[PDB]
Design an enzyme around this catalytic site. Structure first.
Site, PDB file in Angstrom:
ATOM      1  N   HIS B  89      34.197 -36.551  -9.255  1.00 53.00           N
ATOM      2  CA  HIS B  89      32.802 -36.509  -8.841  1.00 53.00           C
ATOM      3  C   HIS B  89      32.154 -35.213  -9.311  1.00 53.00           C
ATOM      4  O   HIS B  89      32.787 -34.155  -9.329  1.00 53.00           O
ATOM      5  CB  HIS B  89      32.684 -36.639  -7.324  1.00 53.00           C
ATOM      6  CG  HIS B  89      31.283 -36.877  -6.854  1.00 53.00           C
ATOM      7  ND1 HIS B  89      30.360 -35.864  -6.724  1.00 53.00           N
ATOM      8  CD2 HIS B  89      30.646 -38.015  -6.490  1.00 53.00           C
ATOM      9  CE1 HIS B  89      29.214 -36.366  -6.300  1.00 53.00           C
ATOM     10  NE2 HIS B  89      29.362 -37.669  -6.149  1.00 53.00           N
ATOM     11  N   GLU B 161      27.575 -40.739 -13.265  1.00 50.77           N
ATOM     12  CA  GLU B 161      26.550 -40.060 -12.486  1.00 50.77           C
ATOM     13  C   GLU B 161      25.566 -39.398 -13.437  1.00 50.77           C
ATOM     14  O   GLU B 161      25.949 -38.460 -14.153  1.00 50.77           O
ATOM     15  CB  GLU B 161      27.173 -39.023 -11.563  1.00 50.77           C
ATOM     16  CG  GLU B 161      28.160 -39.589 -10.560  1.00 50.77           C
ATOM     17  CD  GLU B 161      28.641 -38.545  -9.574  1.00 50.77           C
ATOM     18  OE1 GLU B 161      29.870 -38.414  -9.400  1.00 50.77           O
ATOM     19  OE2 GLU B 161      27.791 -37.854  -8.975  1.00 50.77           O
TER      20      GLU B 161
END
EC number: 5.3.1.1
Lengths: 247, 243
Positions: B89, B161
């Site tokens: 992430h 992302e």
């Protein structure tokens, strides 16, 4: 309030923990604590009496929000953690946790939860005469920005890294020497608190070498690592500190 | 089609705020749903969420069990009952110096398990507007696509992302050609493998844009942040992506 606590570290599972918390549950005016992994904290507090203090081995000084894979002080109190470990060598060595990181996390819970500030010098530091330099550095942000009222709630967990992993044995003189020096750093601020602050030794502690270490005049307990994973061992280390503190 | 709508509750909520979230999410077809709570709340979510909804962990390590405080293992990931795991992430890569070499050692630990890894990738505002987007994206899958077989690269989820987008929002069709590009990378490995791999979009997947972003040709699912915490807006996106 002899503070004897165990770092469980990343070891174990759901079954080996419940078998232990039953074994851990087995004791005068002393203090016992346990720091399990993040995923098992709610189970452990549910399988122990509240007399035993439970905390986490790491949180993050960020407020709740966009912070992946982290836990906060507000999410620390929601689980029911009584204590909190700060500044462990492995978080400092394998993740580069700085003294600035330690003070940031400590300030989150300092005015609340007894903090456990871990400190320790490396083997290269001790051989290069960096012993007292680093330990004063690892204490700089703490002793320079906090008060006796907040210092008293802080619990120092000295762990000598120069003996951990390096295989170099630690004589009981150099153990007493460093604990005597760490207390002297606090004595430069206030001696009445420095003489009644818990400085627990976080090196290699076993049931075999339990005594002659806690019996030293400048030791207020132990941050037991691998030996704390077993009840028949940890509770044996429990009973040793119980008898030597009474008589 | 099939949609994999996943909720990443980064660092939010409490037991009383998660119980209402779990029971309140429980209201779908052969379309997978997953949830990423905090490690201090994983078994609470297992105790309150249905079986068909995935529950993964936000961060683990690659070291085996031993002298490692403040971390979580792949065994503790499996022993706790996590069906998924979020890897790579952007926040852990930005704030905590998570490297591609870390991403790979953690991914390689769990690929031989029944756990579906969710490896996240993405470039920032600097990288795409300077054309580096193709570089800083092929870099992050370089280790992964190198040592992993076509069978190993299966059941691997790519969460892109768009870190480049505060008030400014990634354009709709500006995402499809991005998801087209990353699959053309695995098309060099295997066209069929690049034809089944689920690639979700790791952006502001809010309710008022449920169908449009998920109706783009190369969007295989979703990884939502803020709207995963509000189950009303979370359920609707899975409901507006039922088919």
């Amino acid at each position: 309030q002899k503070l004897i606590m165990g770092n469980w570290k990343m070891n174990g599972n759901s079954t080996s923990i419940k078998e232990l918390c039953s074994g851990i549950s087995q004791t005068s005016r002393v203090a016992i604590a346990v720091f399990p992994s993040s995923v098992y904290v709610k189970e452990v507090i549910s399988q122990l009496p509240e007399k035993v203090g439970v905390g986490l081995q790491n949180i993050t000084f960020y407020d709740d929000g966009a912070y992946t894979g982290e836990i906060s002080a507000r999410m620390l109190e929601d689980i029911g953690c009584d204590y909190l470990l700060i500044g462990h060598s492995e978080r400092r060595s394998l993740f580069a946790e700085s003294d600035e990181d330690v003070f940031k996390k400590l300030n989150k819970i300092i005015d609340t939860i007894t903090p456990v500030v871990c400190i320790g010098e490396s083997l290269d530091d001790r051989q290069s005469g960096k012993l007292k330099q680093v330990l004063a550095t690892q204490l700089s942000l703490i002793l320079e920005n906090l008060s006796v009222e907040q210092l008293a709630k802080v619990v120092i967990a000295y762990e000598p890294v120069w003996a951990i992993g390096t295989g170099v044995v630690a004589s009981l003189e150099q153990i007493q020497e460093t604990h005597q020096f760490i207390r002297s750093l606090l004595a430069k601020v206030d001696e009445r608190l420095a003489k009644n602050i818990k400085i627990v030794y976080g090196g290699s502690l076993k049931a075999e070498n339990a005594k002659d270490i806690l019996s030293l005049p400048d030791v207020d307990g132990g941050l037991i690592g691998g030996a704390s994973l077993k009840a028949a061992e940890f509770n044996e280390i429990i009973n040793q500190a119980n008898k030597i503190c009474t008589e």
